[PDB]
């Protein structure tokens, strides 16, 4: 309780399965946290093989051993394909190499096949002692390591197939890969009507394929769990040509690998290619990404996620009793959870069976939840339509308020579309609240948002300015254009501006409409949401340049980098980028520091720069402190490290945050942009009374947000007391729970 | 050894005599150092009176009691005129109030009459126990405080009369006063031939009067120790009119108070006034400064000097044995010395007697040394002449090299004059070494330096540039203008440039002449001299604005000031101004500081700002450190003192150092400017061989400098190893010996 918890304990880690970027982070974590907890940590080179083999394939991990591992893609402990471990003629000898080295806790990072082989290894572990007792080693060992086999399944597979885990390691980075490709395929097709047919990964799991389609506006997709029952080819080519008139350049048909048809006679990305060339005769071009989806460098998220589980695993190992079942650490709602291994397995296999028989409804369901939504939403945003137009339709407006963010356009896109798909009218507002005000309001036709999903910045224009000081003009406009509901995509001043709207209801009867704030800020400072749109993008930005700055044309080795992140008062970035990059320190506001500490953070990095570490990272929140500025931290770090090392200072500042959204932000921005519009339509129906809408309840004025396992509408006003208005941040930020983890990873 | 030294000891201080600015510093010191040394310190209000009286006139001193006392003129413990103490009917009751309070150590700051009354008080202390034993207090006290009476005479009198002390308290500040007056009288007389006759202080001691004359170019002076034997009135008026033709506006006849004639029938400043009006009939104007020479604020020096003696006294008290004689702390050669009280007295009175009889040669001598010189020099620089012109005269050049300084012109003045007065030729060089070089060389007639003594900056022009790179042109010029010796007034690059000259001797036979560097730099960084010309002026500058910044139109009380001094790497100023102003800290190069300390300097000032102190001073050498800059020290001081206090930063920088010289620098610049020229003339005679001079010895290439009690010629080369050339400073600076004192005064 602690440091004393894993004293007299040892653990071996092992990286089975295919390479999934961020496995390396998991490892690191596991190691660093293992050691930390007084335990000893052993590597196991080459997956289950080094377990089976032993000897030179089981080497002890040091702290210095896992250094510079966060930012490396694939697995460095090694991943093999041992099929000796799938039979008992090899599990025994692995069990031998385990009790021979004296081990009770095993960490297996892998996918569905690697987490099931350790599952059966826990269950068939009782008898492997009595069998490896006929001549194995002394029976004084089996009476000292009995029903004490602890194994934690850390899910690692670029499939996202494993069920029981919201995310798997790598799945984000893989998405990035796919995305960069499409991001370079989509931005060149200017000549002929090029129709790329990109076949992605996915053995049985349509995830990547769908997510990618929902992040690139794929013209059509094929996924395993819901194959295209019946005559579709006419549909697809009726739709590729339906898409050609409407005036379109390129088409992106995404193909899951496990692509199958109604019956099961699999769809082939070439056969597709053929169909469209033979049917429509466009200049088709098949690409099979393949094993480069496992490449590159892990995304911020995957470096974060993998530190999290790798801490969770360690925890779960050392908190393992004879009576405790087999353990699979995995995210859910944004919280670390220990999930029973066997159920996780037994169920992550039910889907395969449910899909083997023609019951694809059951397959869709067993995957279900979000997956089912993405599907629905994608299609619905993938349409060619839209419907026919009524007059008793409510008319919605959508706007951008605050600092721009990656995903603003993606939201916008989904809001309108979804909007229009209800048969409602969608108005669009240029330049935030200066929008209803001046009157720069247009009507949005299905096309208006065409292919925005990927575009970064703000296509409508976003301004920070607030509604109150001009309530007259805006109320006047809500009536003139007949606005009936607001959807506000943006940062703190959307929430703020929202709260401002509530007050307007007292003095004006027009603003008595409902509104939804969708959080879109780089800073992730908006109350009542764990995340915000544009965060991941900014964070991936910072994290990248942090790694590219971890080089510099130095006249010599030994050098320290102090880097000031952005984000006003919110340490999110700093903290997150600080962890994703593995900074010795991330100074943030919410965690105030005294020089007394500041000193000891240095009288420390120096002691490492004097040894193991050759490059040093100090992150600094742009406002974490008024006096201990960039220049103070810097200079301090400099002097103390005179002779010992060199040191440069880098202020990233706000390096054009209008670049291009990462998949996540696109999805996030698309999902919400549907989720709200839907809600909104329901709130406008319930406040229609007598030929006039009247939303005067607190329920009609909300910020949609991420809160644990579910998205949630929370009224602005209910959030007042949850938010610090001086620093424009929320009270209680979930990720402060990570600060320590960032700290022990630095060895504190 | 220590802090334990004065434990079980008490001391009472007393401020007798007339108000002498910096007595207050002496006090402070004495107190602060007394307490420090584990002792207890008692005030004695109203001179010897509060001693005689007692009761409410002897109050215990705290640390907070002597706070903000450095910069206050006069005495705050109080000064009276008790003539009860001059008879034994009152010395007893003082002795009673002493052993009644339980005291063994007495500190008497005063002048000749106050240091003699304590002298006789020590000697007539043996019997005052047996007499105040007939009914005084219990005889168990006289057997516990016997031959244990310790008294230290700290010399304080604006007369400088006391002999045994190089300087007395106030004497500098008084000079300043006189100086400001003349400095405002001298710079207005533009109408008629105004002839001010300023009568200064000085009962028996011609000091002030002479020094002032030697710092203002008095047309004539009258002093006690050498009265104007015989017909002088014709001389003075022969000389005032001799001075009127030559084309002169104003005349300043300085008059010592004790002004007497041959016989003793005193000279009267009005009688003078009369003589010149009746004899020449100019529009005379008598001013009698009087008791405003005791006014104003103490000069840097006097605040420094008084901290020094006041530490010396304390030392001398606690290191007093029954067998040790009476003690008079006083400067000599620039070092604290304990001088026997009775001898100091017995001799400082011999002069009075030696002057009472018509033996003014003996009076002049008993004063003697420097005094005798000043006299000689003044006259010689006061002449109206100069002599007649030979051709076998050696021709000297004088130049300014480096950054300008107050006193450059004063030197220049004396060098030439003295020069010419030997019947030698003096050339003058514009713009340092760019001087012999280009050829901007003029001949200086006696007038050329007329009334420069007071002018600040550099009248010839001073440039830093070095001779080597252009030896050809300068050697070529030394021959053409027939230069035969160099006199270099300036900073480090004069010394440097000097060393450069030595090397030139090897390759050139022309530069084989002798040279003298006279140290003229603001920074006091020139090796082989305790002081440099322009220092005092710069220091008085910094010290002044430090006090004027100790005010600020703050919206509230509680405020800290960080101030960056100048002087390259040399902490002189910083340190000195840091002490003269009483800064909590003076960060300097020569005393390197680690944040570890830096912190504790703050985790300290704060603890005082939280109580006793309302205004805080931090001094910082402009380069004391590369990283812990102004901005670092500042910010650090700020944050830590958040709430507790406020804080501004002030960089004084190099606020036009071409202002106007303080008396000291003028004297110093005048004295040397004679001292060298004399030496120089002797070196040129000894290196004249065969119609060509040849100085190839190391003795002909020297920097004149202050080293303890005497000025000394030291060869450039001999100084190489005494000087740090990277930082352009001397190794071993005398005043680092003060750093601690500055530190305990701040309470460390």
mmCIF file with all atom_site columns, N, CA and C in Angstrom, chain A residues 128-150:
data_model
loop_
_atom_site.group_PDB
_atom_site.id
_atom_site.type_symbol
_atom_site.label_atom_id
_atom_site.label_alt_id
_atom_site.label_comp_id
_atom_site.label_asym_id
_atom_site.label_entity_id
_atom_site.label_seq_id
_atom_site.pdbx_PDB_ins_code
_atom_site.Cartn_x
_atom_site.Cartn_y
_atom_site.Cartn_z
_atom_site.occupancy
_atom_site.B_iso_or_equiv
_atom_site.pdbx_formal_charge
_atom_site.auth_seq_id
_atom_site.auth_comp_id
_atom_site.auth_asym_id
_atom_site.auth_atom_id
_atom_site.pdbx_PDB_model_num
ATOM 1  N N  . UNK A 1 128 ? -0.961 -29.320 -15.155 1.00 0.00 ? 128 UNK A N  1
ATOM 2  C CA . UNK A 1 128 ? 0.424  -29.136 -15.663 1.00 0.00 ? 128 UNK A CA 1
ATOM 3  C C  . UNK A 1 128 ? 1.483  -29.155 -14.552 1.00 0.00 ? 128 UNK A C  1
ATOM 4  N N  . UNK A 1 129 ? 1.054  -29.041 -13.291 1.00 0.00 ? 129 UNK A N  1
ATOM 5  C CA . UNK A 1 129 ? 1.938  -29.185 -12.120 1.00 0.00 ? 129 UNK A CA 1
ATOM 6  C C  . UNK A 1 129 ? 2.156  -30.641 -11.711 1.00 0.00 ? 129 UNK A C  1
ATOM 7  N N  . UNK A 1 130 ? 1.075  -31.413 -11.725 1.00 0.00 ? 130 UNK A N  1
ATOM 8  C CA . UNK A 1 130 ? 1.107  -32.830 -11.397 1.00 0.00 ? 130 UNK A CA 1
ATOM 9  C C  . UNK A 1 130 ? 1.735  -33.672 -12.516 1.00 0.00 ? 130 UNK A C  1
ATOM 10 N N  . UNK A 1 131 ? 1.628  -33.190 -13.755 1.00 0.00 ? 131 UNK A N  1
ATOM 11 C CA . UNK A 1 131 ? 2.246  -33.808 -14.943 1.00 0.00 ? 131 UNK A CA 1
ATOM 12 C C  . UNK A 1 131 ? 3.740  -33.500 -15.085 1.00 0.00 ? 131 UNK A C  1
ATOM 13 N N  . UNK A 1 132 ? 4.104  -32.221 -14.984 1.00 0.00 ? 132 UNK A N  1
ATOM 14 C CA . UNK A 1 132 ? 5.509  -31.786 -14.894 1.00 0.00 ? 132 UNK A CA 1
ATOM 15 C C  . UNK A 1 132 ? 6.073  -32.060 -13.495 1.00 0.00 ? 132 UNK A C  1
ATOM 16 N N  . UNK A 1 133 ? 5.454  -33.011 -12.802 1.00 0.00 ? 133 UNK A N  1
ATOM 17 C CA . UNK A 1 133 ? 5.896  -33.474 -11.500 1.00 0.00 ? 133 UNK A CA 1
ATOM 18 C C  . UNK A 1 133 ? 6.420  -34.914 -11.577 1.00 0.00 ? 133 UNK A C  1
ATOM 19 N N  . UNK A 1 134 ? 6.060  -35.634 -12.640 1.00 0.00 ? 134 UNK A N  1
ATOM 20 C CA . UNK A 1 134 ? 6.543  -37.003 -12.881 1.00 0.00 ? 134 UNK A CA 1
ATOM 21 C C  . UNK A 1 134 ? 8.058  -37.066 -13.101 1.00 0.00 ? 134 UNK A C  1
ATOM 22 N N  . UNK A 1 135 ? 8.643  -35.947 -13.531 1.00 0.00 ? 135 UNK A N  1
ATOM 23 C CA . UNK A 1 135 ? 10.096 -35.801 -13.674 1.00 0.00 ? 135 UNK A CA 1
ATOM 24 C C  . UNK A 1 135 ? 10.607 -34.359 -13.875 1.00 0.00 ? 135 UNK A C  1
ATOM 25 N N  . UNK A 1 136 ? 9.702  -33.382 -13.892 1.00 0.00 ? 136 UNK A N  1
ATOM 26 C CA . UNK A 1 136 ? 10.046 -31.967 -14.093 1.00 0.00 ? 136 UNK A CA 1
ATOM 27 C C  . UNK A 1 136 ? 11.117 -31.401 -13.172 1.00 0.00 ? 136 UNK A C  1
ATOM 28 N N  . UNK A 1 137 ? 10.703 -30.669 -12.137 1.00 0.00 ? 137 UNK A N  1
ATOM 29 C CA . UNK A 1 137 ? 11.606 -30.228 -11.058 1.00 0.00 ? 137 UNK A CA 1
ATOM 30 C C  . UNK A 1 137 ? 11.046 -30.627 -9.694  1.00 0.00 ? 137 UNK A C  1
ATOM 31 N N  . UNK A 1 138 ? 11.822 -30.373 -8.645  1.00 0.00 ? 138 UNK A N  1
ATOM 32 C CA . UNK A 1 138 ? 11.453 -30.722 -7.270  1.00 0.00 ? 138 UNK A CA 1
ATOM 33 C C  . UNK A 1 138 ? 9.991  -30.357 -6.933  1.00 0.00 ? 138 UNK A C  1
ATOM 34 N N  . UNK A 1 139 ? 9.291  -31.282 -6.275  1.00 0.00 ? 139 UNK A N  1
ATOM 35 C CA . UNK A 1 139 ? 7.894  -31.096 -5.844  1.00 0.00 ? 139 UNK A CA 1
ATOM 36 C C  . UNK A 1 139 ? 7.740  -30.113 -4.664  1.00 0.00 ? 139 UNK A C  1
ATOM 37 N N  . UNK A 1 140 ? 8.852  -29.514 -4.237  1.00 0.00 ? 140 UNK A N  1
ATOM 38 C CA . UNK A 1 140 ? 8.863  -28.446 -3.228  1.00 0.00 ? 140 UNK A CA 1
ATOM 39 C C  . UNK A 1 140 ? 8.555  -27.085 -3.846  1.00 0.00 ? 140 UNK A C  1
ATOM 40 N N  . UNK A 1 141 ? 8.478  -27.071 -5.173  1.00 0.00 ? 141 UNK A N  1
ATOM 41 C CA . UNK A 1 141 ? 8.113  -25.902 -5.959  1.00 0.00 ? 141 UNK A CA 1
ATOM 42 C C  . UNK A 1 141 ? 6.605  -25.831 -6.240  1.00 0.00 ? 141 UNK A C  1
ATOM 43 N N  . UNK A 1 142 ? 5.981  -26.977 -6.538  1.00 0.00 ? 142 UNK A N  1
ATOM 44 C CA . UNK A 1 142 ? 4.518  -27.064 -6.768  1.00 0.00 ? 142 UNK A CA 1
ATOM 45 C C  . UNK A 1 142 ? 3.669  -26.844 -5.502  1.00 0.00 ? 142 UNK A C  1
ATOM 46 N N  . UNK A 1 143 ? 4.302  -26.999 -4.344  1.00 0.00 ? 143 UNK A N  1
ATOM 47 C CA . UNK A 1 143 ? 3.698  -26.679 -3.052  1.00 0.00 ? 143 UNK A CA 1
ATOM 48 C C  . UNK A 1 143 ? 4.046  -25.257 -2.584  1.00 0.00 ? 143 UNK A C  1
ATOM 49 N N  . UNK A 1 144 ? 4.599  -24.454 -3.486  1.00 0.00 ? 144 UNK A N  1
ATOM 50 C CA . UNK A 1 144 ? 4.936  -23.054 -3.215  1.00 0.00 ? 144 UNK A CA 1
ATOM 51 C C  . UNK A 1 144 ? 4.467  -22.071 -4.314  1.00 0.00 ? 144 UNK A C  1
ATOM 52 N N  . UNK A 1 145 ? 3.811  -22.607 -5.348  1.00 0.00 ? 145 UNK A N  1
ATOM 53 C CA . UNK A 1 145 ? 3.281  -21.863 -6.513  1.00 0.00 ? 145 UNK A CA 1
ATOM 54 C C  . UNK A 1 145 ? 1.986  -22.476 -7.067  1.00 0.00 ? 145 UNK A C  1
ATOM 55 N N  . UNK A 1 146 ? 1.138  -22.977 -6.171  1.00 0.00 ? 146 UNK A N  1
ATOM 56 C CA . UNK A 1 146 ? -0.004 -23.844 -6.518  1.00 0.00 ? 146 UNK A CA 1
ATOM 57 C C  . UNK A 1 146 ? -1.077 -23.209 -7.428  1.00 0.00 ? 146 UNK A C  1
ATOM 58 N N  . UNK A 1 147 ? -2.282 -22.991 -6.899  1.00 0.00 ? 147 UNK A N  1
ATOM 59 C CA . UNK A 1 147 ? -3.392 -22.357 -7.646  1.00 0.00 ? 147 UNK A CA 1
ATOM 60 C C  . UNK A 1 147 ? -3.133 -20.866 -7.900  1.00 0.00 ? 147 UNK A C  1
ATOM 61 N N  . UNK A 1 148 ? -1.853 -20.535 -7.902  1.00 0.00 ? 148 UNK A N  1
ATOM 62 C CA . UNK A 1 148 ? -1.382 -19.182 -7.983  1.00 0.00 ? 148 UNK A CA 1
ATOM 63 C C  . UNK A 1 148 ? -0.757 -19.009 -9.337  1.00 0.00 ? 148 UNK A C  1
ATOM 64 N N  . UNK A 1 149 ? -1.598 -18.986 -10.354 1.00 0.00 ? 149 UNK A N  1
ATOM 65 C CA . UNK A 1 149 ? -1.182 -18.534 -11.661 1.00 0.00 ? 149 UNK A CA 1
ATOM 66 C C  . UNK A 1 149 ? -2.063 -17.359 -12.034 1.00 0.00 ? 149 UNK A C  1
ATOM 67 N N  . UNK A 1 150 ? -1.438 -16.193 -12.143 1.00 0.00 ? 150 UNK A N  1
ATOM 68 C CA . UNK A 1 150 ? -2.130 -14.978 -12.531 1.00 0.00 ? 150 UNK A CA 1
ATOM 69 C C  . UNK A 1 150 ? -1.742 -14.520 -13.930 1.00 0.00 ? 150 UNK A C  1
#
